[PDB]
Amino acid sequence: VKTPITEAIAAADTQGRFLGNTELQSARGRYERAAASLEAARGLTSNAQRLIDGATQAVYQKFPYTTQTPGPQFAADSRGKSKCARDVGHYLRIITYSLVAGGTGPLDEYLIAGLAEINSTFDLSPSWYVEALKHIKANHGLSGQAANEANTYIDYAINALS
Amino acid sequence: VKTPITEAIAAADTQGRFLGNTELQSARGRYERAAASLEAARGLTSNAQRLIDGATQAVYQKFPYTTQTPGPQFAADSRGKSKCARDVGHYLRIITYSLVAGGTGPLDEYLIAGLAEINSTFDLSPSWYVEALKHIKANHGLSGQAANEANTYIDYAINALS
Amino acid sequence: VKTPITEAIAAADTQGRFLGNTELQSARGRYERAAASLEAARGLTSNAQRLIDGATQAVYQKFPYTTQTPGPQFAADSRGKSKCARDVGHYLRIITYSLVAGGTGPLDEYLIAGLAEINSTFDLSPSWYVEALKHIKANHGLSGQAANEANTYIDYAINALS
Amino acid sequence: VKTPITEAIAAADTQGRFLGNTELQSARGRYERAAASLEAARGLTSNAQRLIDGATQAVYQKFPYTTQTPGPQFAADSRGKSKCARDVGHYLRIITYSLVAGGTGPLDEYLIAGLAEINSTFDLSPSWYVEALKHIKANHGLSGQAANEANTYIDYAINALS
Amino acid sequence: ITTAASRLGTEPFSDAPKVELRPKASREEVESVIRAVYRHVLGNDYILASERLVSAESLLRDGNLTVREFVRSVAKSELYKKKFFYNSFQTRLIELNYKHLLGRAPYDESEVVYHLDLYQNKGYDAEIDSYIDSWEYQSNFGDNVVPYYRGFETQVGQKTAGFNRIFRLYRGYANSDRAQVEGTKSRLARELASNKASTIVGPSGTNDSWGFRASADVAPKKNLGNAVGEGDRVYRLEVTGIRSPGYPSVRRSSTVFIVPYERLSDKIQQVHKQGGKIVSVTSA
Amino acid sequence: TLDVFTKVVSQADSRGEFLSNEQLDALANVVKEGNKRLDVVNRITSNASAIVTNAARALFEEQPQLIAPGGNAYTNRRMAACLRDMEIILRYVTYAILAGDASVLDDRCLNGLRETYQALGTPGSSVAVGVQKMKDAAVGIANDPNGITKGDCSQLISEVASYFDRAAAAVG
Amino acid sequence: TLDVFTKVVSQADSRGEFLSNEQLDALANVVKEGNKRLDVVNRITSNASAIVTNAARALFEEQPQLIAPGGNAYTNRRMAACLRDMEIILRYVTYAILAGDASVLDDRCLNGLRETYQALGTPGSSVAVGVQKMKDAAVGIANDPNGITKGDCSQLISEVASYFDRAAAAVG
Amino acid sequence: TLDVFTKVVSQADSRGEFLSNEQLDALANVVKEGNKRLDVVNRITSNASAIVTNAARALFEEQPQLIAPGGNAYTNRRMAACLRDMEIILRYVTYAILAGDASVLDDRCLNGLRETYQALGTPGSSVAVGVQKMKDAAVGIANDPNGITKGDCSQLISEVASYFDRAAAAVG
Ligand SMILES: *[C@H](C)[C@H]1/C(=C/c2[nH]c(/C=C3N=C(/C=C4\NC(=O)C(CC)=C4C)C(C)=C\3CCC(=O)O)c(CCC(=O)O)c2C)NC(=O)[C@@H]1C
Ligand SMILES: *[C@H](C)[C@H]1/C(=C/c2[nH]c(/C=C3N=C(/C=C4\NC(=O)C(CC)=C4C)C(C)=C\3CCC(=O)O)c(CCC(=O)O)c2C)NC(=O)[C@@H]1C
Ligand SMILES: CCC1=C(C)/C(=C/C2=NC(=C\c3[nH]c(/C=C4\NC(=O)[C@H](C)[C@H]4CC)c(C)c3CCC(=O)O)/C(CCC(=O)O)=C2C)NC1=O
Ligand SMILES: CCC1=C(C)/C(=C/C2=NC(=C\c3[nH]c(/C=C4\NC(=O)[C@H](C)[C@H]4CC)c(C)c3CCC(=O)O)/C(CCC(=O)O)=C2C)NC1=O
Ligand SMILES: CCC1=C(C)/C(=C/C2=NC(=C\c3[nH]c(/C=C4\NC(=O)[C@H](C)[C@H]4CC)c(C)c3CCC(=O)O)/C(CCC(=O)O)=C2C)NC1=O
Ligand SMILES: CCC1=C(C)/C(=C/C2=NC(=C\c3[nH]c(/C=C4\NC(=O)[C@H](C)[C@H]4CC)c(C)c3CCC(=O)O)/C(CCC(=O)O)=C2C)NC1=O
Ligand SMILES: CCC1=C(C)/C(=C/C2=NC(=C\c3[nH]c(/C=C4\NC(=O)[C@H](C)[C@H]4CC)c(C)c3CCC(=O)O)/C(CCC(=O)O)=C2C)NC1=O
Ligand SMILES: CCC1=C(C)/C(=C/C2=NC(=C\c3[nH]c(/C=C4\NC(=O)[C@H](C)[C@H]4CC)c(C)c3CCC(=O)O)/C(CCC(=O)O)=C2C)NC1=O
Numbered sequence A, B, C, D: 001v002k003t004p005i006t007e008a009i010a011a012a013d014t015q016g017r018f019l020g021n022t023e024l025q026s027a028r029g030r031y032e033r034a035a036a037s038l039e040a041a042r043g044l045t046s047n048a049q050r051l052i053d054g055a056t057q058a059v060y061q062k063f064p065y066t067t068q069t070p071g072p073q074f075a076a077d078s079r080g081k082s083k084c085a086r087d088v089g090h091y092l093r094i095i096t097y098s099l100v101a102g103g104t105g106p107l108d109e110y111l112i113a114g115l116a117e118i119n120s121t122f123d124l125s126p127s128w129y130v131e132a133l134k135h136i137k138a139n140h141g142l143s144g145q146a147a148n149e150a151n152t153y154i155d156y157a158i159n160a161l162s
Numbered sequence E: 001i002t003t004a005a006s007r008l009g010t011e012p013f014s015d016a017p018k019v020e021l022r023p024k025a026s027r028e029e030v031e032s033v034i035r036a037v038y039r040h041v042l043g044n045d046y047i048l049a050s051e052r053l054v055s056a057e058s059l060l061r062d063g064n065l066t067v068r069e070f071v072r073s074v075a076k077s078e079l080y081k082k083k084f085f086y087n088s089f090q091t092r093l094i095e096l097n098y099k100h101l102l103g104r105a106p107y108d109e110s111e112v113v114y115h116l117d118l119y120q121n122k123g124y125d126a127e128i129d130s131y132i133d134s135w136e137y138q139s140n141f142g143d144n145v146v147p148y149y150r151g152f153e154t155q156v157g158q159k160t161a162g163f164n165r166i167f168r169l170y171r172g173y174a175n176s177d178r179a180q181v182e183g184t185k186s187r188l189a190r191e192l193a194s195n196k197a198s199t200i201v202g203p204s205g206t207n208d209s210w211g212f213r214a215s216a217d218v219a220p221k222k223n224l225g226n227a228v229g230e231g232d233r234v235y236r237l238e239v240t241g242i243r244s245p246g247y248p249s250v251r252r253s254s255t256v257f258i259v260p261y262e263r264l265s266d267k268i269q270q271v272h273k274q275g276g277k278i279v280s281v282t283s284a
Numbered sequence F, G, H: 001t002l003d004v005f006t007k008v009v010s011q012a013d014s015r016g017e018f019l020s021n022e023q024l025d026a027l028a029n030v031v032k033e034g035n036k037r038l039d040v041v042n043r044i045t046s047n048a049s050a051i052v053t054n055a056a057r058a059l060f061e062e063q064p065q066l067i068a069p070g071g072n073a074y075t076n077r078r079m080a081a082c083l084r085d086m087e088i089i090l091r092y093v094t095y096a097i098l099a100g101d102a103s104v105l106d107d108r109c110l111n112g113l114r115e116t117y118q119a120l121g122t123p124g125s126s127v128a129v130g131v132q133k134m135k136d137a138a139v140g141i142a143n144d145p146n147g148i149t150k151g152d153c154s155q156l157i158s159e160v161a162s163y164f165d166r167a168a169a170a171v172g
């Protein structure tokens, strides 16, 4: 995983030297950033049931054919819609993981590695989850400097989908 | 050279990816550290003629034989003492360089690379400059948080001598 | 270890070929050299207690501060002077080892590998043992062509210190 | 080329160190060997026309078919026998070269490199030149220590043919 | 190569023993393997004691480590990047990693194309893993054998255009490859996609003139014109350094001349009067 | 790889004197504008893939012969490579914005781009238009205030417009 | 890689005392027998290829099933490899004769030969027999005086017969 | 890597004739002066590190701008580059003295030194002064008799002064 604490560690490991002031200043940049990021994670965990209900209904109204077309890949049957709230319910965990970790580590290790690899096989269009995250980007209800911190990881996932 | 801005750059270069929030938080750790480090550099540049006079006389009183023993390596003649104030006058530049750069880059690139390599050849004992820097460590006159920042680079040079 | 017998062996090993006349002539160069080198080792082993007493007292008169300055590194206390005769008593073994082996093998493997590595840490100045060996170089009492051959291993150790 | 002088040089080059006493003893092994080897070369250069006449006639009596069988490879025609004295006249040069150089350098660089490579193509049986050299081994006329030195390079060429 | 190796300066590589790593541990042979790794991989740059990577070495003493895993670890180290990767172009590096890790100059441009799409998708640290985990590495270098230059011999399957890109890579044993006057830029990025093979220039003193690089818009190697000469033999002679009369007379030193046969004998006499040195004439 | 700080360091190393007072006064201003520098760099990489596709369509409309057969960007491979590359300008531009210096931009993405095209056959001019179509959209993305505090960064945004103009004019 | 000299050196290093007088008296004898050591080593490498083929025919007669199909040394390739292996015994034996010590013989040609055969299927006993057939011919080549000065080297030739017996018994 | 012997060998190989009698008479003289060649080579490597530091101080006094800031040998690292290197002239010179030929000196330490400096910025004069300050001290170290038998080696010492002058004039 990648964390700007461990980013300072693994960089000093390859040179084989002690933690100088170069790696040390990377730590307090992570520390005081957490105080604008931990209540950025509290805004998402409190609103957990709102957003996965909101983004799933936003996908169906954006793409009206995905409720009607017969196929496993789509959401015509009940299982599909049961797998719908599982998927976007899985996205909001990693965003709260990567906000709390303070880096794009959990987004790298758990979501986007091989994400373009599976979507070619199961013909899941990535533009489905683009509109899903863009609903969360506009309706997460967070405000201020802390909100900006929660806004980048949403946009970092979108550029990984495309 | 090594700078926790460029430490964030060269790390993101080998992975071949954009500047995420992992590398970005390493920048503001360097930025707000400079405000306790730039007037830590102003305390040394204003007191430039004091410390190189102070550390040079502190070396002679610590090692009284280095003024008496005949040799080029020593400070018996006048050009030895002329090369005395050149050497410790060269140390205080890099400490003010590495305080302003905010990393141990200029200490790496300009002072300690091959520093143990030359001292075996010219039989310059490194314990001479250990006592020279320890006089600067006690008589710099810096106070507060800024002093702590100027105190590590003095101790980082001492561990490189030994 | 390095020996001009084994120097002929390890060279013929990498080419994967038999001991030709190229490697064979390196052997008798070692053999007839031993007859001027074995009684060069007998001149040192018979005079063992003379030289370690002579070189240790020569160090104190050259550097008079090393008996007065308080520190573990110096010879102010009794256990310093007990460690004094241990160190130069350890040098004369390897010179008699490298004279008998006929190469700089034991000087490489047992003395000078990491010799500049430890002296930076324990602040033992190498110019101490330079003057120690130079007393042995002038007072070993050996004569003739055989004496000259030994003279090289003393000078080979000095260039390794510097 | 390979010479136990240059064998001492190229070995000290890869370690990046000076010519110690390890490489130096390989030189005088080459030097005093030359005095039993240079008049070993004078015994061959004075008897040049004897041996190439002797070895060529020894080949024909050993293999009587090589004078009768029609082919370019054989010695049926005149230009075969003209190429006969050229080949064994070329062997005696390199033996006098490798005796004077004191190593198997010229035997390596000029004779046996690719010697088993060409004889598969031109169907020249190596057992032809085995009996050619064995006549030179018995009829060189060299005696004493010098003869022993000239005897190895003949046997070193035979093992390279087989 | 011998009596061309004296001129080109490749006589030490021509008779160079393989170091290996026999599985019995000994400090000296390990000490001489380590100099053989850092000399070839870092291009005869020097390593100081802070630059030694002494923690890399501890693993090497143990049986499990193999020169091959060590050569992966020196190139991924930030020391090696500080000399080569930061102060250079990415195509130059793809060209450069074949010189160190594989030992040969790049054959085609298509080999190069594969690396970029690997470098983007998986990073530089997985690019060096693809140089090491190649069949051409495993065939000629074992796990316990140092990479050496294979540019000279046949290494069957090589193209000869790559025989001469290796002489564009290093200028002698003595050189750093940061110490060539085109240091930062890729010397072979133009040659790889023009798909021509430029002229071998050897190093200094053995060759009187080392100062020849291929220009941007230079004369074509094979020509069509009879060139006034009565008999068609046409030869293409280039000069290296011209310091003849100044500002209008020489606007461009190192210009390539194409001179036919019957005035070739006077042409060499004009070039020497100009103080220029000839690296090559070539029939076409 | 150089900073604004190590720009002053390597310049003060060549004269061999201590760092002057106004240089520390100027670098103290870079600390104050340091938080605006993270405002502009974070806004580009969030809109990185959206500005690659949007500048690609405006390029391949206005020069239609590229996609067209016989063009340099016709087949799906070359096209993929060219499209992929337009990030590599933006990869090395946003390095230089966060560095505040054009040294990282020069020796990686500028040192051989005008070199590599004569052997490749790609038109230099076409690439410049592509980067100049990034510049008016990258400045426009960082310009507009929506949910950020209002400040003034016209002295800082002009550095970004200089960086694309450095990247454009070195090729075409 | 150890000598007779560095055998005494590394043994005297462990006790940490100076080299005793009789050890220098013993090593002075090795100088006197040093020229006989070059007599014996030069005689083997001159007859190296002649003793590989001659010991091979006596092996492959007396165990005919090896060359025969199904045998371990049947096909030309394995057969070529086996021939090479025999020399490699002689390569590391004549190293040990010129070294005067069995340390070089042990860690290269002895340390894994009895190891490598269980995975290979080669017969250890057969290999041992082949090695022995070298020993009675290698001793017999160095024994006979023809054109050399007569001396006594029975205390030195027994070292060579010990080296092959060390090489034989460590495998079979 | 060539000798005095293999110089005559490769020259006699090109003509394709046997070695003439006076060439063996000349090489017999090299055997007689062979022990003086080991006298001169052993004296340099014993005083190797003492003549590197002593020639360095005389260089860096008489060109003070080098270790002054802005100079090519200013910082500690490059300074060790130069210091480490001055052995490499002496490493390849004493190879050539013991070889008796300048072939090893030419293709390692001479073939690219005048090449490598235009890309490096190291001045030519510094190298020439540095090696020419070694030469008058290396000749002076091997000249004086103290505890050796007196002989005449002026025809041999002039080879050493030729080797440094070959190393000096090929760079500056
Ligand atoms: C894009 C707007 C235009 C374009 C792009 C294009 N380029 C190529 C081929 C190459 N591109 C490069 C570029 C770089 N290499 C580097 O190392 C860096 C900095 C990190 C850059 C920017 C190189 C080296 C090549 C050569 C081959 C390679 O991919 O490795 C192509 C493919 C062309 C071909 O295959 O012949 C394309 C399509 N070309 C256009 O048409 C656009 C105008
Ligand atoms: C100046 C900062 C550096 C420098 C320059 C230098 N140049 C020469 C010689 C020549 N310079 C040119 C240049 C051009 N000719 C052209 O047609 C063009 C394109 C418009 C250019 C740029 C040429 C052709 C020459 C030839 C020699 C002449 O003067 O006619 C020298 C003299 C070299 C000599 O050996 O005499 C020098 C010194 N040198 C430095 O050290 C500066 C850093
Ligand atoms: C922790 C991060 C993470 C995510 C997000 C993830 C998604 C993911 N969704 C999948 C399938 C699926 N994904 C969906 C979701 C959708 N399809 C639609 O029709 C809608 C447009 C859209 C939802 C808005 C559906 C319905 C399936 C089942 C498709 C099938 O079974 O073929 C699959 C393959 C099968 C599976 O195990 O269920 C994966 C791996 N996996 C992960 O590890
Ligand atoms: C930019 C960083 C930098 C430093 C600091 C540096 C020091 C340095 N000091 C040196 C010598 C010296 N250093 C000293 C200094 C001292 N000796 C004493 O007696 C005193 C105890 C002590 C001063 C307090 C003296 C007197 C010399 C000359 C010694 C000689 O010539 O042998 C030398 C070797 C010769 C030289 O060029 O002058 C170096 C390289 N070099 C560097 O590149
Ligand atoms: C410098 C060291 C050196 C030697 C010695 C050498 C020998 C040599 N002799 C050859 C052929 C030959 N060698 C011989 C010699 C003989 N055949 C006989 O019938 C006689 C028994 C015997 C002479 C006593 C003949 C007749 C040929 C021509 C055979 C052919 O053309 O097929 C060939 C292949 C063709 C060639 O270029 O001429 C080589 C390479 N090459 C070398 O580079
Ligand atoms: C044995 C064959 C051999 C030679 C000859 C050799 C020379 C050599 N000198 C080098 C550097 C260098 N050489 C010098 C030498 C000097 N600079 C000055 O201004 C002084 C006048 C002078 C010393 C008196 C310096 C200073 C450097 C380092 C330059 C730098 O780091 O920028 C380099 C570049 C690699 C490196 O520095 O790590 C090489 C290859 N390398 C070899 O393998
Ligand atoms: C020579 C082989 C070759 C092919 C076939 C090829 C196709 C190709 N079609 C593209 C876009 C496109 N492809 C289509 C085609 C379709 N979209 C639809 O809605 C329909 C379902 C479908 C046609 C039946 C459209 C409409 C675009 C423009 C989409 C956009 O601009 O985002 C693009 C990206 C942009 C471009 O340059 O125009 C490529 C590379 N490229 C190649 O090099
Ligand atoms: C690395 C993570 C990180 C980020 C992203 C960051 C951004 C950041 N931008 C700030 C301010 C600001 N940022 C902007 C930026 C702009 N306003 C405009 O109208 C322009 C269009 C645009 C520039 C193009 C402005 C105007 C301010 C006002 C406050 C200040 O000067 O810092 C501040 C001041 C403190 C605060 O907002 O709580 C923060 C935190 N700080 C961090 O620690």
Ligand SMILES: CCC1=C(C)/C(=C/C2=NC(=C\c3[nH]c(/C=C4\NC(=O)[C@H](C)[C@H]4CC)c(C)c3CCC(=O)O)/C(CCC(=O)O)=C2C)NC1=O
Pocket (backbone or CB within 6 Å): G057, G060, G067, G074, G075, G076, G077, G079
């Ligand atoms: C499966 C494929 C295969 C083949 C063909 C093969 C041949 C082969 N024949 C050999 C010997 C032999 N080969 C022959 C055959 C001949 N000599 C002559 O005089 C005749 C001209 C010629 C037959 C027409 C003879 C007589 C021996 C014994 C020679 C000796 O013992 O020195 C040998 C070496 C000793 C041996 O094990 O018997 C091999 C390896 N080996 C293989 O693995």
Ligand SMILES: CCC1=C(C)/C(=C/C2=NC(=C\c3[nH]c(/C=C4\NC(=O)[C@H](C)[C@H]4CC)c(C)c3CCC(=O)O)/C(CCC(=O)O)=C2C)NC1=O
Pocket (backbone or CB within 6 Å): G066, G072, G073, G078, G079, G081, G082, G083, G085, G086, G088, G089, G108, G109, G120, G122, G123, G126, G127, G130
């Ligand atoms: C320098 C010390 C050293 C030795 C000795 C050595 C031996 C060695 N013998 C091998 C194979 C072999 N060796 C033999 C040998 C024999 N077969 C018989 O029946 C006979 C008893 C015997 C020949 C006298 C055979 C048949 C193989 C190959 C077996 C197979 O691959 O199936 C291999 C396998 C791969 C390869 O050869 O490249 C090694 C490494 N390696 C070493 O580093």
Ligand SMILES: CCC1=C(C)/C(=C/C2=NC(=C\c3[nH]c(/C=C4\NC(=O)[C@H](C)[C@H]4CC)c(C)c3CCC(=O)O)/C(CCC(=O)O)=C2C)NC1=O
Pocket (backbone or CB within 6 Å): C021, C024, C025, C028, D033, D144, D145, D148, D149, D152, G035, G036, G038, G039, G040, G042, G142, G143, G144, G145, G148, G149, G150, G151, G152, G153
């Ligand atoms: C059959 C049993 C037997 C052996 C083995 C034997 C060897 C033998 N080799 C001798 C001499 C010698 N042997 C050598 C051999 C060499 N020196 C070198 O440097 C070369 C590399 C090498 C030849 C390649 C030399 C140089 C001598 C000097 C004395 C002489 O000329 O005989 C002598 C002379 C008398 C003595 O040493 O006591 C003996 C005894 N004598 C015997 O009765």
Ligand SMILES: CCC1=C(C)/C(=C/C2=NC(=C\c3[nH]c(/C=C4\NC(=O)[C@H](C)[C@H]4CC)c(C)c3CCC(=O)O)/C(CCC(=O)O)=C2C)NC1=O
Pocket (backbone or CB within 6 Å): C033, C145, C149, D024, D025, D028, H035, H036, H038, H039, H040, H042, H142, H143, H144, H145, H148, H149, H150, H151, H152, H153
């Ligand atoms: C200052 C000018 C000068 C030199 C150079 C000089 C050298 C010199 N070395 C000599 C001897 C010698 N020199 C050596 C040296 C060695 N042999 C080896 O095998 C070793 C590797 C090497 C020592 C490391 C030996 C062994 C001798 C034998 C004679 C003696 O003991 O002097 C002799 C004795 C007289 C003579 O040779 O005519 C001379 C002249 N004499 C001079 O007047």
